Every structure is written in structure tokens, then in C-alpha cells.
Amino acid sequence: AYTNSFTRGVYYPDKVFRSSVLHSTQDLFLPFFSNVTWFHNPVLPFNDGVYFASTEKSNIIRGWIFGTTLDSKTQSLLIVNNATNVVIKVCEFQFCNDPFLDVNCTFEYVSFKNLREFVFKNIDGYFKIYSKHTPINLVRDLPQGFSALEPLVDLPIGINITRFQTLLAYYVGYLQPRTFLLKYNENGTITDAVDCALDPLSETKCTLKSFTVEKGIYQTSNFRVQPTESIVRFPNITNLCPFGEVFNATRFASVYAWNRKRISNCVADYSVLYNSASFSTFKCYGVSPTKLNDLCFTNVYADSFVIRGDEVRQIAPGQTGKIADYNYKLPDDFTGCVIAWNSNNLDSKVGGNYNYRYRKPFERDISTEIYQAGSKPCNGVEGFNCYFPLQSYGFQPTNGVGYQPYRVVVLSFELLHAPATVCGPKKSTNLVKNKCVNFNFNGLTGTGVLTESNKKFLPFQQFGRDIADTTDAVRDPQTLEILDITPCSFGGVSVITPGTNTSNQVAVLYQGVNCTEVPVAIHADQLTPTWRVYSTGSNVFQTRAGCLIGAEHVNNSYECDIPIGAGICASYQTQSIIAYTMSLGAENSVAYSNNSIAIPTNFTISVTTEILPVSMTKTSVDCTMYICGDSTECSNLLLQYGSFCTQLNRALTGIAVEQDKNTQEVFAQVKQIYKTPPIKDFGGFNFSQILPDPSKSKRSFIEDLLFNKVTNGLTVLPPLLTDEMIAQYTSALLAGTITSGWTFGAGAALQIPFAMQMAYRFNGIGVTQNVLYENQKLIANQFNSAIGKIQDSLSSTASALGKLQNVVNQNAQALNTLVKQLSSNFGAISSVLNDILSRLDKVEAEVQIDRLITGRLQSLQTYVTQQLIRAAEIRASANLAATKMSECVLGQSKRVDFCGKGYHLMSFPQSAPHGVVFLHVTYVPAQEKNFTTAPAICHDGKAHFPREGVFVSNGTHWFVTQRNFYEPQIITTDNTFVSGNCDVVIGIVNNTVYDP
Amino acid sequence: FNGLTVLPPLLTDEMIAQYTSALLAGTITSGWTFGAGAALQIPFAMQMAYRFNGIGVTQNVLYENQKLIANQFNSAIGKIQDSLSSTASALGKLQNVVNQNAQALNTLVKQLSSNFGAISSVLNDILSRLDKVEAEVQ
Amino acid sequence: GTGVLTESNKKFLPFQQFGRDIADTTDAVRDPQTLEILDITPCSFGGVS
Amino acid sequence: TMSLGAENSVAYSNNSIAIPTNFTISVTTEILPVSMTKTSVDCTMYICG
Amino acid sequence: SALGKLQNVVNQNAQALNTLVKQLSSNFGAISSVLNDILSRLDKVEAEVQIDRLITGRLQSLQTYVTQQLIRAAEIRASANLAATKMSECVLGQSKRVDFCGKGYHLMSFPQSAPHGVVFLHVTYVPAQEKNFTTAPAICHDGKAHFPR
Ligand SMILES: *[C@@H]1O[C@H](CO)[C@@H](O[C@@H]2O[C@H](CO)[C@@H](O)[C@H](O)[C@H]2NC(C)=O)[C@H](O)[C@H]1NC(C)=O
Ligand SMILES: *[C@@H]1O[C@H](CO)[C@@H](O[C@@H]2O[C@H](CO)[C@@H](O)[C@H](O)[C@H]2NC(C)=O)[C@H](O)[C@H]1NC(C)=O
Ligand SMILES: *[C@@H]1O[C@H](CO)[C@@H](O[C@@H]2O[C@H](CO)[C@@H](O)[C@H](O)[C@H]2NC(C)=O)[C@H](O)[C@H]1NC(C)=O
Ligand SMILES: *[C@@H]1O[C@H](CO)[C@@H](O[C@@H]2O[C@H](CO)[C@@H](O)[C@H](O)[C@H]2NC(C)=O)[C@H](O)[C@H]1NC(C)=O
Ligand SMILES: *[C@@H]1O[C@H](CO)[C@@H](O[C@@H]2O[C@H](CO)[C@@H](O)[C@H](O)[C@H]2NC(C)=O)[C@H](O)[C@H]1NC(C)=O
Ligand SMILES: *[C@@H]1O[C@H](CO)[C@@H](O[C@@H]2O[C@H](CO)[C@@H](O)[C@H](O)[C@H]2NC(C)=O)[C@H](O)[C@H]1NC(C)=O
Ligand SMILES: *[C@@H]1O[C@H](CO)[C@@H](O)[C@H](O)[C@H]1NC(C)=O
Ligand SMILES: *[C@@H]1O[C@H](CO)[C@@H](O)[C@H](O)[C@H]1NC(C)=O
Ligand SMILES: *[C@@H]1O[C@H](CO)[C@@H](O)[C@H](O)[C@H]1NC(C)=O
Ligand SMILES: *[C@@H]1O[C@H](CO)[C@@H](O)[C@H](O)[C@H]1NC(C)=O
Ligand SMILES: *[C@@H]1O[C@H](CO)[C@@H](O)[C@H](O)[C@H]1NC(C)=O
Ligand SMILES: *[C@@H]1O[C@H](CO)[C@@H](O)[C@H](O)[C@H]1NC(C)=O
Ligand SMILES: *[C@@H]1O[C@H](CO)[C@@H](O)[C@H](O)[C@H]1NC(C)=O
Ligand SMILES: *[C@@H]1O[C@H](CO)[C@@H](O)[C@H](O)[C@H]1NC(C)=O
Ligand SMILES: *[C@@H]1O[C@H](CO)[C@@H](O)[C@H](O)[C@H]1NC(C)=O
Ligand SMILES: *[C@@H]1O[C@H](CO)[C@@H](O)[C@H](O)[C@H]1NC(C)=O
Ligand SMILES: *[C@@H]1O[C@H](CO)[C@@H](O)[C@H](O)[C@H]1NC(C)=O
Ligand SMILES: *[C@@H]1O[C@H](CO)[C@@H](O)[C@H](O)[C@H]1NC(C)=O
Ligand SMILES: *[C@@H]1O[C@H](CO)[C@@H](O)[C@H](O)[C@H]1NC(C)=O
Ligand SMILES: *[C@@H]1O[C@H](CO)[C@@H](O)[C@H](O)[C@H]1NC(C)=O
Ligand SMILES: *[C@@H]1O[C@H](CO)[C@@H](O)[C@H](O)[C@H]1NC(C)=O
Structure with a gap:
């Protein structure tokens, strides 16, 4: 019988306090929503540790036995409660299947409406126990909910437990190795958890280290088709x-x-030779002697001789001595083995066996030509300084061991190149095509898909290679057809999520994978590590970008929420996640004709917003303190690397000073600290939210939203200008802009009434200035209301300031990464330097320390190089911000869409963390009407053209009007100029042109 | 295929062609207005008079020469087709963005054939030929 | 380690012996002879200009 | 503490304008870099001499 | 001191090559920093293990130099594109972009050459000697409002 485990069985992994934090950990845990066995008893397996529970208030459940034999034959745990105490012992006991209630000892120790829970696990010879108590109402199953078990007992008793039983409603499950994400509150209790492998959303939560995720698409994984079978192909x-x-x-x-x-x-068996005790040495080079049976070769050459026992040391690559110089030399890159033995009885004899003698790589020459000891005419004949080239070994069996004969066999291997022809003893298999498989062609191992091919190998050619050396096609050794290899199908795996706030559903994209490969592979119905079984969630759909699982295909085309690729998007709708080809927008046939014009009769003022980075966090690094942790031995090695731990500080100093330049270039545009008048008769425009609040530093109201909505050896440094100095500059810029127009950008500020300044801002966009005064209250109300909406927009969402937030988040990520790279081993014996200094002699310790120096130096160069690139990217924004402040704030830019969308009027800077915000104010025309139009008018045969503005008719009368706001005027001469007669102009019309 | 991959662009080229078409159709029927707000239609020879004022040439100069000006424009777009049709090296900037990435990937892949001081550039050789304690070094 | 040991307000659970930073750096300890919680800070360092 | 510059109350009102009555032509230098030293290195001869 | 920018372009290239040349004298853990010592004191099987440390250290030194020059070249190209723009807009024209072609209202500018750079002489109108007046946005005549052209 079985029951759902829900979220039960989490326990504190370590005796560490952590608080207000999400932490990722790997341990033996009960997987969520698994099946727990139920009981009301027999012996049970212990496996890799147990989760145990019972509903109780009778207290009939009294203890446990753990061990292997459960009684007598070996030491076994007894754990019992007697109401006086909890009791433990490990004895070779003397009890039957149930010695309990009617309703050596090398260690011993002493210390329904409710449920008891326990976890038992056994690691490093320590047996560990964790616990919880709870009230409950539900008796018929485990209580669905959460509460972390806490440690009680931890004992060095070391028993190899494989079984347990309860001593007299109760429940059992098994722990398995998993990654969990745990939530610690402000008081450092565990309060929630995620089992990362459970489902795609749980992979996503663990990937992001968060218990909630926003709407989007996230990579969590990589998919690869697994090898389904194995093949061995060998010459028969x-x-x-x-x-x-x-x-x-x-x-x-x-x-x-x-x-x-x-x-x-022939077929060899090197293991028979290698396992033989007969050989005094079996040294080997480019192959380990254990592996030789798995290999195959074009040739083997056995080189054979007898030599004096102490001289065998010359038989290796790179050696020197008379035998190497004149008798037999191995090449200095020899591939094979040297095997030798004390052939004393075999090769020696009691006459000193004079049959044996001694005198380039694999040279042999038996020549009798004399060793001359000088430039004499020895002429091949014996004499003083003239000696025969061979000398005899005195091999008598009574010789001391270094003077006895030894036999030597050298084995030299020529690999698989041409068809292999000496081979190991391996069993060949059948060949299988089109599947993903492991394969072994003559010891050439790999994984892939095998198919037919059209590759015309010439008769000597045995396999093809790709650019990367990787074997691309093979001749089968038993049947000379040419097989293509291909790598098994693979791609990135991405999870589409509506936002956990909004729904729990997800869809999964297998990027670039064909759906026929997917739902019976590493996704579902086969060997499915972590990318677990759901062969369909309801639908499986082939997109251009990859196979998409669990989303519903739609034939409509909406706007795009979650973009997939190749014009596909997804969103959550009437409910399910759908997927569709996106629409670029509403289609619109513009109402063109050769004679019709639309003129706007009304406008809106709009206040947009634009946010720009201006400076990183400044930093400098004491690279000796970072790399070496103030150890003297490490510091002395770090001298050998020269100037690296100085050009790093020089580079970061360049970055650091440039931040103060960026900040000064953007804000210090103004020579004097202008201040606002006491009166506020700015024609009804209300700046109170963007001017300083003196009751606040003296920031504006909107600046106080912006400063709230954004939130070792390594030393941070302060900015030069303080946040209160930046607020003085944004105040001075704003006070100049209000009281004096652009004039404070061209030397001395000239005062002008604000309503007259706006009349000139209108006069810059071609709207005749009277249009402002005649609409002054309306314009002021539109502006005041638009500033009001900025407060609500900045109040509405944390996503409003994502640009500045990314400067903060990247600096924190970079520094945390640079700190976590202290803990990495880089292949050294430990990452904790004091281990290496304490556990090893200095000659070995140096090599280990030098890996940590190399790893930390390569890590620190990697950090500094990313700061250079990231600072160059911020400087492009600082130059853009300084330009927008020069043209938009200090002026009125005519550059289309530079200072916000619409025709530009002015803009106001506001300070923010690491950047600046501009409130660009723009005119947008808003209520158009169609009119008939003609490029000229003929009066007395003279063709008239308007001086500024365009001719229009309402269908009966003709007027001239300005291009951006309907205001019809009678066509007097003074609106116009003549040029020539009617006939050259297309579409000219007849009207009166009036003379004043 | 060595763990390298290429992802598709989000906007497919038949979507890009709809954006360049819309920008062109706005620019013909409505001048600059479709940047500043909702598009406002105007006759094209009347848009060109505003463009002439935009360089300080008085708008009567257009109408007094409209047939000539149209022919000069049409002739230039003819020469554009012959130039682009003729000279394949004209797109040298774009073609370098293609070639530079091809050399970048080819170098990254060819580096898998390097030894870096190992026994072999091919990882399965070492794993076939050597036992663990030596294979780690290589 | 090395540092300035200080008295602290931290609220460790009974079984917890020491505290860690967000970046896993050890930064608080229970004194095994008097079960109050201390706060650990590295001894001061900085560039000299 | 550095000074950002002299403070200035602009003499604003809803009915006052200031207009200039003279001018200066002024000539201002601006300096921009354009090219580095064209450099080349033999990576065989540097490394292996 | 006006030419501090151009002189700093000279100085950074001088420091980069000095740093690259100094690193030839570093051991990187080889028995000598002079390659002919290794080749004259040692036989090849020993020598290659020492030489490989110099090859590694000198190669990492050289990649570090080339990467900082790639970044510095892009940083100069941003200035070359800005100079090419100022020459097209300020010299070949009269730019209305506020504070682009020197402070004040821009009239014109002249180029002068300089080693590794360019110097612009921006000529500008700056108003001076201002007087207060009373002002009003419009004037009534015969009950109709008037505004200045
Ligand atoms: C070919 O013949 C030459 C002699 O003419 C051989 O030279 C010997 O090479 C070894 C190198 O290990 C030296 O130690 C000897 O001193 C050389 N002999 C003389 C007389 O100088 C050469 O090794 C031969 N090569 C082959 C492959 O057989
Ligand atoms: C131009 O548009 C504005 C709104 O942006 C119009 O103002 C509104 O007019 C209606 C009456 O027609 C009132 O109910 C609203 O309260 C007005 N809003 C504001 C902000 O005052 C304005 O009437 C339009 N002008 C013309 C000539 O149609
Ligand atoms: C300028 O606008 C602000 C709001 O943006 C006005 O401040 C509000 O005024 C009313 C009436 O005094 C108060 O009830 C509110 O509490 C004020 N809001 C805040 C947030 O303080 C201000 O009165 C306007 N001033 C002028 C001259 O128009
Ligand atoms: C075109 O505009 C003219 C002038 O605004 C309009 O003519 C006026 O029409 C009203 C009645 O709607 C009369 O009371 C006025 O006496 C007319 N004035 C003049 C100068 O004729 C005319 O109605 C408009 N036509 C259309 C088709 O809208
Ligand atoms: C504008 O009005 C004039 C008359 O005032 C029109 O000119 C006449 O057009 C007819 C038809 O082409 C000719 O037969 C007459 O000889 C013309 N008379 C004169 C005095 O030129 C003219 O066609 C009208 N224009 C338009 C565009 O309708
Ligand atoms: C202005 O230059 C253009 C050529 O750029 C001249 O246009 C040509 O004029 C001749 C007659 O002189 C015609 O045969 C051609 O067909 C015209 N070319 C085109 C493309 O139409 C034009 O005449 C010149 N105008 C003046 C006043 O000199
Ligand atoms: C395993 O658990 C599920 C619920 O999570 C349940 O439907 C299923 O019947 C269980 N299977 C067994 C054999 O207990
Ligand atoms: C419980 O066990 C202890 C020894 O562990 C023993 O002294 C005590 O008498 C027992 N209590 C009862 C109620 O039997
Ligand atoms: C007692 O322990 C020793 C080893 O310490 C072992 O040899 C012996 O068999 C054990 N006897 C019992 C009764 O467990
Ligand atoms: C556990 O088993 C090992 C052999 O696998 C044995 O040497 C050891 O003594 C056992 N320890 C205990 C305490 O049972
Ligand atoms: C945290 O502990 C304090 C006492 O140390 C207590 O006042 C507070 O209510 C606790 N808060 C939570 C969320 O457990
Ligand atoms: C060599 O001979 C001995 C017996 O003299 C035998 O044990 C051994 O296996 C033989 N080895 C080979 C390779 O024949
Ligand atoms: C060996 O290979 C040949 C050629 O394919 C085949 O005819 C023969 O049956 C094979 N023999 C064995 C024992 O595999
Ligand atoms: C999820 O987001 C929507 C707005 O997109 C919001 O209305 C809803 O309240 C959020 N869900 C929760 C649990 O608050
Ligand atoms: C996917 O694979 C099948 C064969 O298994 C093939 O018929 C189909 O055309 C393939 N589709 C794509 C888009 O690759
Ligand atoms: C969507 O279009 C396909 C053909 O392109 C068709 O098979 C399918 O039935 C359509 N769906 C609906 C709801 O009409
Ligand atoms: C202008 O007229 C056309 C029909 O001629 C119509 O489609 C269009 O909607 C009209 N525009 C306005 C603003 O009324
Ligand atoms: C406008 O177009 C119509 C139909 O193409 C044509 O009859 C008329 O003559 C044209 N008028 C002008 C001024 O081009
Ligand atoms: C240690 O002993 C002293 C008395 O000698 C006592 O005051 C103190 O509380 C004890 N601490 C612990 C943790 O037992
Ligand atoms: C303008 O200033 C110059 C000196 O810069 C002076 O000589 C000249 O007389 C002044 N002109 C007027 C009209 O004040
Ligand atoms: C204008 O008059 C005010 C006093 O009303 C004075 O403070 C200010 O300095 C005067 N400005 C000029 C340009 O004379």
C-alpha cells in the first residue's frame, strides 16, 4: 500500500545559520510527490537512508532496530524509548522477532491528533538522526504541508546498515541524491523548498535562484539523444x-x-604476458599495460637481446650510454613497452659465457671496423691505440646481480592507420545503422549515428577525418562498405513561463531538435536524466525554431509576449499556453490621393521618460592580498610573474577615474549654481514635483521616487561628486531652464517669463506662437496632468528602471563571481591555501600553490577584462547623456526622435543611481480632418504659392493654413508670392487672391 | 557540430520586408508626419515642395521643373540597379561581417586539432590508451 | 580566521554554531563557553595614496 | 569641500526680460585623437628569440 | 597642457610596449628568463619542460597586450568618428546642435593638424552687456491682439 509524500521530509542540511536568503544544496533527500509505503510488522531494507513517520497518541510505536542480521551474529543498533529516557545501544544482541510490549556493546547512550517524523542517514561512519513533532487532523494519509526536520543525534558508530524494523499508522520512504533550493527567513529557519528535478518550472526556479519567476523564456538545460546500444567492429x-x-x-x-x-x-592477448610474474620489469609508455587488450594495430615489432643487469636502464626513450650510442637505441618518443628479466641461469655459463658481446634509433651494424683511440694509421688492424670494436660480457652465473645477464623484449606498436592486422582478443558484434549508438572500430571508440555513404575511398584509405581531426567516415573492417558517422542530435532546452504570479503552467522548447527524436529519448519513455517524463503535456508541435511541447498552436496572429524565434511567439490565454506566428501590428492603407491632405485640428502635450547609465561602481584590487591571502610563500612565487599584479591596478585606475569624468561631463554643463525665485507664477505650469523639496538631501519629489525604485582584497572607492552635489547640479540645470530658456547655455543667463519661453519653443516647431497664448490654460493643464502621470508610472512597477538596475546587478554579479572563484581548486589538492602549506613538503607544495596562483591570476585578468568592455559600453551611454543634456536641456533639438517622440519642446533632467533620467516634453498632433488641396492657385493668370503653410479647401472655399494646426486664413496677396503663368504647374486651381 | 550551434533571428526576412515596406509606404504617402504622430496623407509632389524649403530652395522651383525632376530621379534609380547588379564587391561591409564570423568559427573548430602538449588532439585516444591516473595529466 | 570579534544581536537557532554571508563568507559565531553570538569583521585594509 | 561655483538668483518675473547690447566673437580650441602608432609584432621572434 | 589628450595617446602606447618588453625578463618559474641559458645548460628532455614555461608566460603576456590594444583601438575609433563628424558639420557647415561645435552660438570652425590627432578652432558668437526691460506677450491695438513676426 502507498501514499503521496507531497513536500514532506526536508531537514536542516548543516549546523549553519543563514538568514533572509535562498540557498542551493545537494544532499540525500526524499523527492517531492514520490510514493511512501504505508503500514499498520516485517523487516524493511534501509538503502541510502530513510524517511520515517507515524501518526501517534497511543504510543504503541516504541523504537527501531537497524543493522544487517538484526540479532546475535554481529553488532546492530537498538533505538528505544522507555518514557524515562531515549536509549541507544549497538550490541551483538539476544532477541527474537518481537521481544517488546504486550499491547559486546561497544557503544551505548541515554538522553491520531499528532504525528512524529524522523530521518535516518549514515555517512562517513556517522549515524545521524533528525526529527519533528506536529499536531494534525488528517489520519488517513501524510499531512500535506511543510516543516523542516531538525537534528537530534550524530554518532561515530560506523555500522554498515542495510535493514531496519519498527518495535511495537506508520510510513516509510527512501532518500536519494538531489539538488534542493531552500528558503531561510529573517530568523534563519528553513520555511520552504524546491526539488529542482521535479518539473520544468522547478528547473527554472533553481536556475534563477528564486521561488517566483517573471513572464518569459528561460534556458535551463541541454538535450542530447542517448546511446541506445553498443557496437564492436574488428578484423575477423x-x-x-x-x-x-x-x-x-x-x-x-x-x-x-x-x-x-x-x-x-593474428589475435593477441597482452593480459597473459602482463599478468606473468616472470618479468623483473614491464614498463610502458604511450599506452598503459592494463588497456592493451582493448586495442588494435597495423604492426608490432618485438626487439630482442640479452644485456648486463645494471645496463637495462639505457632501454628507455631519452637515455645515454654506450649501448644506446653504438648497440641499440630507442627513439625519444617510443610507443610501447619494455619487458625484461634476470636470465642468469639461461644466458650465463661457468666459463663467463664469452658468446655475448657489445660494441642511432633502430640502427644495427655488425661491422668489424676498428675503434681507433687516436688519428693513427690503424688501417683496421690491432695495436696500441687501435682496438677491435666488440667487447665480451663476462656472464658467469656466480656474478653479483648487476653483473648477471638479463633478457630484454621491447614491444614497439604501429597503430591503426592502414587496416589493423595485429589485434586484441575482443568479441565483435553485429552492425546497426540509423540509431544513436556507441561504437568501437578496431579500438577507435565514439558515439553517434552510423549510415551508408557515397564517399569514394581510394583502396588504401581506411577512414575520413573532419577539420577537427574527428573521424567522419569509416570502412567496416569485416565488409568494406563506407559508413558515415554523424553526432547524436542535441540542443538547448528552454522553458516558457506565464509568470508564477499569474499561472503554474509551462511549455518546453527543444531548440533545433526534430520532434521525432524527442519524446522517447532524454525527454520521456526512455533513459530520461533530469528532463523527466511527460511525452506529451497535451500537444507536441514542430516549429521552425525547434520542437515545442505543452503549448497549443493557434492560426490567428496577435502581438508578441514571449518570443520563441523564426516569427513564433507564445502567451497564456482562454486556459492554456498558446503558440502562434506573431503580427507586426495593425495593417493600415493610408488614404492617399493626388489631391487630398489631412491637417490636425488639435494636439496633446506629452511627457515621455528616458533613462541612461552614466557610471559603474568604482573599484581597485590589492592583487597580492586577493591571490595569496597574505601568505608569504605564495607572495614569493607571485614575484616570478612580473608586472601582472601592477598593470591590473593601472587598468582598474583607468576605469575608476573615467567614472568621475563621465559624471562630470554629464552634470557639470553649467558654470554657476542657479536658484529658483520664491514666487511660482510660471503661467500655470507646475514644476513642484521636479524642483527641490527643501524638507527632504534636497532632492525633488520625482528624484525621491527614483532613489527608492532602484535598490576581500577587493576595495570599492567613493564617487567624487556626492549624491547631494549631483542634486545641486540637476537643480541648477532645472532652475536655469525654467527662468532663462536656452540662454544659460551661451554664457550669461537672460531672464524671460516662462509663458514667453514656451511661445518660442512652439515657434521652433513651426506652430505659430499665438496658438500657445490662445490655449495657455489648456496647455498648462495638459502639462501638469502629464507630470502627474509620471508619478503613477514610476509608482506602478519595478520594471520601470531596468536600465539602472542592470548596472547595479552586473557589478554585484561580477564581484560575487570573483569572490567565489577563490573556492575553486583549478586541479590543486585543495582551494584552502593553509592545507597545502601544512600537509606537504615545500617541493610538492609549490606545484599545488602555483595552480591556485595561476587560477586566481587567470580569474582576476578575466574580471578586469570584462570591466574594460563593460566600462566602454557605459561610456557610450555617458557621451549620449552629455549630448542629450547639451541639445535637449540646454537647447531645443530639431533631430527627429532624439529628444522623445513627437516634435520636441524641452526636457528636464532628474538624478538617479548610477545614471540620469530625462523628462522629454513633446507636441503631438491629435485630431486630423481631410481637405482637398492644390500646390498653387492661378488668379490673373499669375500662379500664386503660399509663403508658409499649405492651400486647402473645405469643399467650397479656399484657404491657406499652417502645416501643423488647422487655422484657415483668406488668401490675400501677403500670404503668397507669384512665379510665372499657370501652365507649367500640375493641379493648379482658380480662386480669388485678395488685395488688401 | 562540436557543441557549436546557430540560433535563428527572431524577425524572419519576410517580416523584415514588411517593416521596410511600411516605412517606405509611410514615407511616400505621408512624409515625416508618421514619425511625429498618426500618419497624415499628402500628395507626393506636395511633399517634395516641403523638402525643397527644407534645403532653402524656393518651392516654385519644383513645379516649374517637375517633369525634369521626376526623370532625373527615375534615371538615378536605374543607375542604382546597374551598379548593384554589376559589382558584387559593393556590399563589402556586410560581406566582411559574414567572412569574419566564418574565420572566427573555423579557428575555434581547428583548435580542437591542436595538441597543447598532450599525447593526442583526439580525446578518445587518451581514454582508449591510458589508465586514469595518467589520463588526468594529459 | 582573523578579524575584529564583536558582540552581536543575531538570533541563531539552538543547533546552529556559526553564520554565513550571502557570498558564503563566515561572519558570526557562538562562543562554545557562553552561548551568545559574536559578529566577525576582517581587520582593516586599504590603499595608501 | 569643493565648490560647484557661485550661486545665482536669476531675477525672474512674469514681466521682465533681459536683452544683450554687445557681443564677443570667441575662438575655442578643441583637441581630438585620431590614430594610434601602427604597431606590428613577430609572435615567433618575440616568444622564441 | 591643452594637448594632454594627444600626449596621453603617445604615453599609453609607450607604456604598453615597455610592459611587453619588461615581461621578456620574467622567469614565470623557468630556471632562467634567458632562453639560450636553458638551451646551453640543458639537454632536450629537461629543456623542453623549462622552455614551455617561458612559452606559456610570454604567450599570456602577448595575448594581454593584444587584447588591451583591441579595446584601445575601438576607444580611438569612437574619437575618429567624432572628429570625422565635427569636420563634416562644423568645418564643412554651420551646426545648430547646442554645445557641439564649441560653447556659444556657433559661427564656423577651422581644422589644424597635430601628431596623432586634430585640433579644431571653433569660432562662436557670445552675447554680452545685457539690460533689463519690461515685456508683455502681445499688444492690444483696435481691440485685436498683435504679436511680433
Ligand atoms: C648510419 O651510419 C652512421 C655511421 O656512418 C651511424 O652513425 C653512428 O650514430 C650513433 C648515434 O647513436 C653515434 O653514437 C655513432 O658514434 C655513429 N658512428 C660513427 C662511426 O660516427 C648511424 O647511426 C647509422 N644510422 C642507421 C639508422 O643505421
Ligand atoms: C483638444 O483636446 C483637448 C483634450 O486633450 C480638449 O479639451 C477637453 O474638452 C472637453 C469638451 O470638448 C472637456 O470635457 C475636457 O474637460 C477638456 N479637457 C481639458 C484637459 O481641458 C479640447 O476641447 C480640444 N480642442 C478642440 C478645439 O477640440
Ligand atoms: C502643484 O501640484 C502639486 C501636486 O503635484 C499640488 O500639491 C497638492 O496640493 C493640494 C492642495 O494644497 C494638497 O491637498 C496636496 O496634498 C498636495 N500634494 C502633495 C503631494 O503635496 C500643488 O498645490 C500645486 N501648486 C500649484 C501652485 O499649482
Ligand atoms: C467653408 O468655409 C466657409 C468660411 O468659414 C464657410 O462659409 C460660411 O458658412 C456659414 C454657414 O455654415 C455662413 O453663415 C457664413 O456666412 C459663410 N461665410 C463665408 C465667408 O462664406 C463654408 O460654409 C464652408 N464650406 C463647407 C463645405 O464646409
Ligand atoms: C481658370 O479660369 C480660366 C478663365 O478665367 C480658364 O481659362 C479658359 O479655359 C478654356 C478651356 O481650356 C479656354 O477655352 C479659354 O480660352 C481659357 N481662357 C483664358 C482667358 O485663358 C482656365 O481653364 C481655368 N483653369 C482651370 C484649371 O480650370
Ligand atoms: C538643367 O540640366 C538638365 C540636365 O541635367 C537639362 O535637362 C535636359 O535638357 C535637354 C534640352 O536642353 C533635354 O533634351 C533633356 O531630355 C533634359 N534631360 C532630362 C533628364 O530630362 C536642363 O535643360 C537644364 N536646364 C537649364 C535651364 O539649363
Ligand atoms: C505513485 O504516486 C502517484 C501520485 O503522485 C500515484 O497516482 C500512483 O498511483 C503511485 N504509484 C504507486 C505504485 O504507489
Ligand atoms: C529506562 O532506561 C534506563 C537506562 O537507560 C533505566 O535506568 C530506567 O530504569 C528505565 N526506565 C523504566 C521506566 O524502565
Ligand atoms: C566483540 O568485539 C570483538 C572485536 O572488537 C569481536 O572479535 C568479537 O567477535 C565480538 N563479540 C561479540 C559477542 O560481539
Ligand atoms: C563496515 O564494513 C567494512 C568492510 O566493508 C568493515 O571493514 C568495517 O569494519 C565495517 N564497520 C562496521 C562498524 O560495521
Ligand atoms: C524573529 O525572532 C524575534 C525574537 O528573536 C521575534 O520577536 C520575531 O517575531 C521573529 N520573527 C519571525 C518572522 O519569526
Ligand atoms: C614461456 O615459457 C613458460 C614455461 O617455460 C610459460 O609459463 C610461459 O607462459 C611462456 N610464455 C609464452 C609467451 O609462451
Ligand atoms: C569474416 O568476414 C568475411 C567477409 O565479410 C565473411 O565472409 C566471413 O563469414 C567472416 N567470418 C567470421 C568467422 O566472422
Ligand atoms: C499577476 O500579475 C497580474 C498583472 O499582470 C496581477 O493582476 C495579479 O494580481 C498577479 N497575481 C497575483 C497572485 O497577485
Ligand atoms: C523530422 O524527421 C522526420 C523523420 O523522422 C522527417 O519526416 C521530417 O520531415 C523532419 N522534419 C524536420 C522539420 O526536420
Ligand atoms: C489551422 O490551419 C490548419 C491548416 O493550415 C488546419 O489544419 C487547422 O484545422 C486550422 N485550425 C482551425 C481552428 O481552423
Ligand atoms: C479621410 O477620407 C477617407 C475616405 O476618403 C477615410 O477613409 C478616412 O478615414 C478619412 N480620415 C479622417 C480623419 O476622417
Ligand atoms: C489625379 O488622378 C486622376 C486619376 O488618376 C486623374 O484623372 C487626374 O487628372 C489627376 N490629377 C492630377 C492633378 O494629377
Ligand atoms: C562554563 O562554566 C562556567 C562556570 O565555570 C559557567 O558560568 C558557564 O555558563 C559554562 N558555559 C557552558 C556553555 O557550559
Ligand atoms: C562693445 O564692446 C567693445 C569692447 O569689447 C567696445 O569697444 C564697444 O564700444 C562696445 N560697443 C557698444 C555698442 O557698446
Ligand atoms: C534687473 O532688475 C533686478 C531688480 O529688479 C536686478 O536684481 C537685476 O540684477 C537686473 N538685471 C540686469 C540685467 O540689470
């Missing part, structure tokens, strides 16, 4: 190799005349 040789004639023959050669045997067309 029956013959076995002639090693007795190599190793055990009578005539092992004298060393200057060394013998070579070629081996070919």
Missing part, C-alpha cells in the same frame, strides 16, 4: 600471435646485433 582473424617464439626462444641476440621480429595477421 582466427590466427593467434606467436609470442612463445618471441619470449621463450633459445637465441636472444647480443646487444649490438639485436634481433627484430615482426608480428602480423
